[PDB]
Design a binder for these strands. Structure first.
Ligand SMILES: [Mg+2]
Ligand SMILES: [Mg+2]
Ligand SMILES: [Mg+2]
Ligand SMILES: [Mg+2]
Ligand SMILES: [Mg+2]
Ligand SMILES: [Mg+2]
Ligand code: NA
Length: 326
DNA sequence: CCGACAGGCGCATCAG
DNA sequence: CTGATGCGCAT
DNA sequence: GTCGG
């Protein structure tokens, strides 16, 4: 809430640039700026003060001065009053509808939940499920519910094979009091970077979670990434729990630490860390950290035995998961 | 200035 | 069909 | 939209 007006303004501009303008680097620029400002431990008194922060430049500083003086931004007032911009922005809130499809839909006269719900024939699988659970997917998940979900996933995984290790990542691993969805990092010894010695390792877990009615729908499903929907069991005469988004990522066992770093985030933290790695001459993904050659082609994976090792390579002091949040 | 901006999975689409 | 591209998504 | 060389 310190500088919350400013960070809200910048987040709104980010979403506009992503959803309406389709300018992913401007979106990221506004998000980077929002993040550094959120971290800044002083009440910002001018745009020039803000501009000293990395990621805040001339145009954001001028917007900040406007906001400080008036309590609003004309650019955003205008955006808020434009039906077409608002409609496109709205439709992107449905899982599976991004900026491109949102624009195409609004151009075809589809601009409301009502319009989506009578035009389901125009929606792909992912989008149909996103619409079905539109309200539920907007709701956050209390940590208490995350803990019940974790208990279910870890116990069902164990029933399939005691050699699986499932780790709940994302905001949950960062200590958050509520989470947007559940993210599960999965490993099994027969899946490494050197061999897949058993097939269907992810499939058997997904199937077991479906069998016990925890997983209720599938948005997408490959050999290493599952994206879908789950729901806690509720008791007699109690309202149902909201359906929840779940992501499962099966990662090579020997690459657990790059995997857990990726899947713990936050998203902005990973972008900042990965960008820092590049400046240091390395590239990081969910599998490995590799050095960069002169043309920017990656070399051989470096040895990693801990999350901290990755930080060490790029000369960052270790940040515990709880300090990787926005 | 100005090229770079994080990385990649699953899925759809198009050219051939 | 394969291969290249882009979308929408994950952190 | 912002930054590092
Ligand atoms: Mg600055
Ligand atoms: Mg969407
Ligand atoms: Mg999450
Ligand atoms: Mg997720
Ligand atoms: Mg599928
Ligand atoms: Mg997220
Ligand atoms: Na790799």
């Amino acid at each position: 809430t310190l500088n919350g007006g400013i960070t809200d303004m910048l987040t709104e501009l980010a979403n506009f640039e992503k959803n309406v303008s389709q300018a992913i680097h401007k979106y990221n620029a506004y998000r980077k700026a929002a993040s550094v400002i959120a971290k800044y431990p002083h009440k910002i008194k001018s745009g020039a003060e803000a501009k000293k922060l990395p990621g805040v430049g001339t145009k954001i500083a001028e917007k900040i001065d406007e906001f400080l003086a008036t309590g609003k931004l004309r650019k955003l007032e205008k955006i808020r009053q434009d039906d077409t911009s608002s409609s496109i922005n709205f439709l992107t809130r449905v899982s599976g509808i991004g900026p491109s499809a949102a624009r195409k839909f609004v151009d075809e006269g589809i601009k409301t939940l009502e319009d989506l719900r009578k035009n389901e024939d125009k929606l792909n699988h992912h989008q149909r499920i996103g619409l079905k659970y539109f309200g539920d997917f907007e709701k956050r998940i209390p940590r208490e519910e995350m803990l019940q979900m974790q208990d279910i996933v870890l116990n069902e995984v164990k029933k399939v094979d005691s050699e699986y290790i499932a780790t709940v990542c994302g905001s949950f691993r960062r200590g958050a009091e509520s989470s947007g969805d559940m993210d599960v990092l999965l490993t099994h010894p027969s899946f490494t970077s050197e061999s897949t010695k058993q097939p269907k390792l992810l499939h058997q877990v997904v199937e077991q979670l479906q069998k016990v009615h925890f997983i209720t729908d599938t948005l997408s499903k490959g050999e290493t990434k599952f994206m879908g929907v789950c729901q806690l069991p509720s008791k007699n005469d109690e309202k149902e729990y909201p359906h929840r988004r779940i992501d499962i990522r099966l990662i090579p066992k020997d690459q657990y630490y790059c995997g857990v770093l990726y899947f713990t985030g936050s998203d902005i933290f990973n972008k900042n860390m990965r960008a820092h790695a590049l400046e240091k001459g390395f590239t990081i993904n969910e599998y490995t950290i590799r050095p960069l050659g002169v043309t920017g082609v990656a070399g051989e994976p470096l040895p990693v035995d801990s999350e901290k090792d990755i930080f060490d390579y790029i000369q960052w002091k270790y940040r515990e998961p709880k300090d990787r949040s926005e």
